Design a binder for these strands. Structure first.
Ligand SMILES: [K+]
Ligand SMILES: [Mg+2]
Ligand SMILES: [Mg+2]
Ligand SMILES: [Mg+2]
Ligand SMILES: [Mg+2]
Ligand SMILES: [Mg+2]
Ligand SMILES: [Mg+2]
Lengths: 121, 216, 122, 34, 103
RNA sequence: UUGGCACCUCGAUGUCGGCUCAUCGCAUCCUGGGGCUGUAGUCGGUCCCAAGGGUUGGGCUGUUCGCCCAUUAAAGCGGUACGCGAGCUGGGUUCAGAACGUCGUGAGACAGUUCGGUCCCUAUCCGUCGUGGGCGUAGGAAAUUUGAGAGGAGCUGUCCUUAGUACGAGAGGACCGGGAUGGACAUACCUCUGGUGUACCAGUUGUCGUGCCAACGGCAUAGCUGGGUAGCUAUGUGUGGACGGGAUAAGUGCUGAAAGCAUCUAAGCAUGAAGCCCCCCUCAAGAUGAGAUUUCCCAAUUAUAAGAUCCCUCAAAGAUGAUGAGGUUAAUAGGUUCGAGGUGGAAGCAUGGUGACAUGUGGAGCUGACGAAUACUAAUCGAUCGAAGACUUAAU
């Protein structure tokens, strides 16, 4: 792995934790190529705690996932942590890893940057 | 003389008879085959062309070097082989021996013989003038602006050119180096390994070339 | 390691206690010295009453280091201080009685006179 | 550190032989969106 | 160390299964045999275990002692033939795995 | 060298030492050959051949140079804008201030000595180190190679045995030739010793966030401290210097004329130096004098064949290009399941202590870069270039 992304340690550890979260809520996001080859890994190590579901993994499924976002789906309220162990974990109980998918759109207008999609599967 | 080809694997040590330590590299050498014996009447020099590792056979939509091609495949089967990846010629060896299409066994190397090794170096990119050529760097206090740099390049309005063999930065790395007069420790036969006393060039999984020494 | 402007100590009964190194006896621009090596020193601190006063240049020999020595059997030995012993023209010691251990490498170094006298060889 | 001469009309244009741009790929018009 | 297992196979008949176990801070004795002539003797080193690294033939440790005021240390390979035997005689409790606060 | 002359430069040729780099010359400081003598032996002395390589760390004053301790095989003299400031310094050098002495009626000087005092420039052309695109080499492409030519390496010391024999008045001392162990220097590597290791492991203070339990996170040089995987590194780990030959300087000689004899050069002719070309390592056919083999591909302007490139996944490679590994008949990178090496015994319940604590379930649990196996994710889709053997003159 080992990409720095022109952002020092204290900044990269907080940019890769916002990407992992807001993705999960909407399951589909739009980023540059590099970043999504690094949440290619951070988020794949984060469902593998959700299948255990034990009391210890929730304690290490919080040291990277991000502060309690009081969601509101259809007439409800969730947390990103009582959605990851209840719902994604249950869809994905019988596959191995590899539940992300990158897709290449075109470049951007201003900075000439490759833009890609990333979702779950 | 004698010569075999193979890959560098790693590096470890062994204990001698007097409990002494002896440091060693670990050379793997399998699947060598002779492909063309030469002549003075044709080329002007006797030699032995040898190839080492096996690969796969011709394929239609072929877009690697894994799968061979027709000119290669028309050169393996000639001497009744498979397609060979690496190829080299050895020139200092007797040619009345070494019939064609055979194999070459490590067993032709005893333990305690003397050799010389030949391979590639490791890669350093665009590097300076004191890692490369290794020469003195300048003061860092007492009001100085010369730290890591090549100082002067020429003299004056006499010899206003700049001579050619001059030391400037650039690229050092994957060049061809040899090492003279190492020792053979031990020779397995099943795993097809030969051990050598000392460390020899290249990176892991590279390629190595082994041959008998000429010196005394 | 022991180079110029280095301060060893002394482990013999000859008055000189501390010294200062100013040379090493190789010659092709040599710039260090380990165990078994003849050097040149002075004194900076003595004991009142003895045979080697302060301000006297003398040759001397190592017996201990912080950097050890690489035995051919794949073994290493490093102490926790440094030390020196003061010698004469006849390739032998000024004083008589040795204090503190020494290193076995001094047998094949023609310093058998000092292993001939020392409590713990090691 | 300063130009001693003028740059002619040719030496300006002998230099831009390689100062062009390139073409995309061509998949059936469809993009090469691997 | 299963890389392709060709190095941990060759270096198989240079091991030895004679040697007791030990962690740091476990006093133990070390019966070397030292060769300085046609035949020579043993000369124990005793002390306390501060360091242990590695795996394979290249697995080492070292022990500390004080001897007439001075400290000394000797580090050894585990599988060499010099070392007749090792004799662990005491055991302790620590919280570190490299010990240098002993100086 | 101190000078003489005043031929270039005053619409600027802008600087004495020391630091970094290097390059030539011998009228040779050491090593290498020898002659000569009172060199008996050593130790020298003298002149002769020789430039391949080699040629030290520190104290006092500005110190160019000078004196001094300490080592060394030896610690060489000269050139190249008194080599190098668009590469560094500014003690020294003549700026403005102020003291102290010789001087002047005063403005001020001659400094005979001291203290304090702004260093401008984005490299166009040639030259130099490194790396690539385009045509060409009488059909087109993939691998292996010869080497006209060019560059590089080149040093030395002590012990002891040779062998106390040649020789030396005897003691002393080679030749011979055997190793053993080294200093400086030049190159590959990371198994050992050790240094770093900013997405790894424990410990630990302050303060914000959950009207607190602390189990957690954020910022405070990575908040500090103890350690440390892969990876690049030296102070660590291993090799190298060549011997050996072909002749050539001085210098040793033999036949041999000169002039009978003589005589080392005259017709002849063996000899002999670290020097010179050959032997050892590296790059090389744009070597337009464009080479040599091996196999593969073969037409109705004109499509296309062998065969490569675009393009996507990655490093054993890398400024970018390029080199290399692999593209669903697929183990390329990621992930998942197992191992290694590292840290040093979690959480949570359960016994023991009034208490803060320590024990046991369990060498526990977590683990970035190294190794293996496994098609769950994406290497999809599809496009573009691309040859059809001339002419004589011979032999067939
Ligand atoms: K100095
Ligand atoms: Mg400045
Ligand atoms: Mg694209
Ligand atoms: Mg004049
Ligand atoms: Mg003049
Ligand atoms: Mg005139
Ligand atoms: Mg804050």
């Amino acid at each position: 792995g080992y990409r720095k992304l022109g952002r020092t340690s204290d900044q990269r550890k907080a940019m890769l934790r916002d990407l992992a979260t807001s993705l999960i809520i909407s399951e589909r996001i739009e980023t540059t190529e590099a970043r999504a080859k690094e949440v290619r890994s951070v988020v794949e190590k984060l469902i593998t705690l959700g299948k255990k579901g034990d009391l210890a993994s929730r304690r290490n499924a919080a040291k990277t996932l991000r502060n309690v976002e009081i969601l509101n789906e259809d007439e409800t309220t969730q947390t990103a942590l009582q959605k990851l162990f209840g719902e994604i974990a249950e869809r994905y109980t019988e596959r191995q890893g590899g539940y992300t998918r990158i897709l290449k759109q075109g470049p951007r207008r201003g900075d000439g940057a490759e833009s890609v999609i990333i979702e779950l599967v | 003389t004698k010569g075999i080809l193979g890959r560098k694997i790693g590096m470890t040590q062994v204990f001698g008879e007097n409990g002494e330590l002896i440091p060693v590299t670990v050379v793997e050498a399998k699947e060598n085959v002779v492909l063309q014996k030469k002549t003075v009447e044709v080329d002007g020099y006797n030699a032995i062309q040898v190839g080492f590792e096996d690969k796969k056979a011709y394929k239609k939509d072929a877009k690697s070097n894994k799968y061979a091609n027709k000119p290669a495949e028309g050169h393996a089967k000639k001497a009744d082989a498979a397609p060979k990846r690496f190829i080299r010629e050895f020139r200092n060896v007797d040619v009345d021996a070494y019939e064609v299409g055979q194999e070459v066994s490590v067993d032709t190397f005893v333990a305690g013989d003397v050799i010389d090794v030949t391979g590639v170096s490791k890669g350093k990119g665009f590097q300076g003038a004191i890692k490369r050529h290794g020469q003195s760097r300048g003061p860092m206090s007492h009001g100085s602006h010369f730290h890591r740099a090549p100082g002067s390049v020429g003299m004056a309005s006499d010899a206003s050119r700049v001579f050619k063999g001059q030391k400037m930065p650039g690229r050092m790395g994957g060049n061809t180096v040899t090492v003279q007069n190492l020792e053979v420790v031990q020779v397995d036969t099943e795993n097809k390994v030969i051990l050598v006393k000392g460390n020899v060039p290249g990176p892991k999984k590279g390629l190595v070339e082994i041959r008998t020494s000429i010196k005394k | 390691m022991i180079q110029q402007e280095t301060r060893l100590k002394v482990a013999d009964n000859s008055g000189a206690r501390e010294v200062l190194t100013i040379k090493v006896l190789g010659g092709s621009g040599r710039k260090t010295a380990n165990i078994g090596d003849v050097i040149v020193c002075t004194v900076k601190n003595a004991t009142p009453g003895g045979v080697v006063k302060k301000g006297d240049v003398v040759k001397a020999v190592i017996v201990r280091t912080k950097s050890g020595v690489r035995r051919n059997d794949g073994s290493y030995i490093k102490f926790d201080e440094n030390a020196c012993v003061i010698i004469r023209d006849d390739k032998g010691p000024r004083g008589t009685r040795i204090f503190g251990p020494v290193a076995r490498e001094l047998r094949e170094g023609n310093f058998m006179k000092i292993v001939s006298l020392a409590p713990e060889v090691l | 550190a300063v130009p001693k001469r003028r740059t002619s009309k040719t030496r300006k244009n002998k230099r831009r032989t390689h100062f062009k741009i390139s073409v995309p790929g061509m998949t059936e018009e469809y993009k090469l969106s691997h | 160390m299963t890389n392709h297992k060709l190095i941990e196979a060759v270096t198989k008949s240079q091991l030895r299964t004679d040697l007791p176990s030990f962690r740091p801070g476990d006093t133990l004795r070390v019966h070397v045999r030292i060769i300085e002539g046609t035949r020579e003797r043993i000369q124990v080193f005793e002390g306390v275990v501060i360091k242990r690294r590695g795996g394979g033939v290249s697995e080492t440790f070292t022990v500390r002692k004080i001897s007439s005021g001075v400290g000394v240390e000797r580090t050894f390979p585990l599988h060499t033939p010099k070392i007749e035997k090792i004799e662990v005689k005491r055991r302790g409790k620590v919280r570190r795995a490299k010990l240098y606060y002993l100086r």
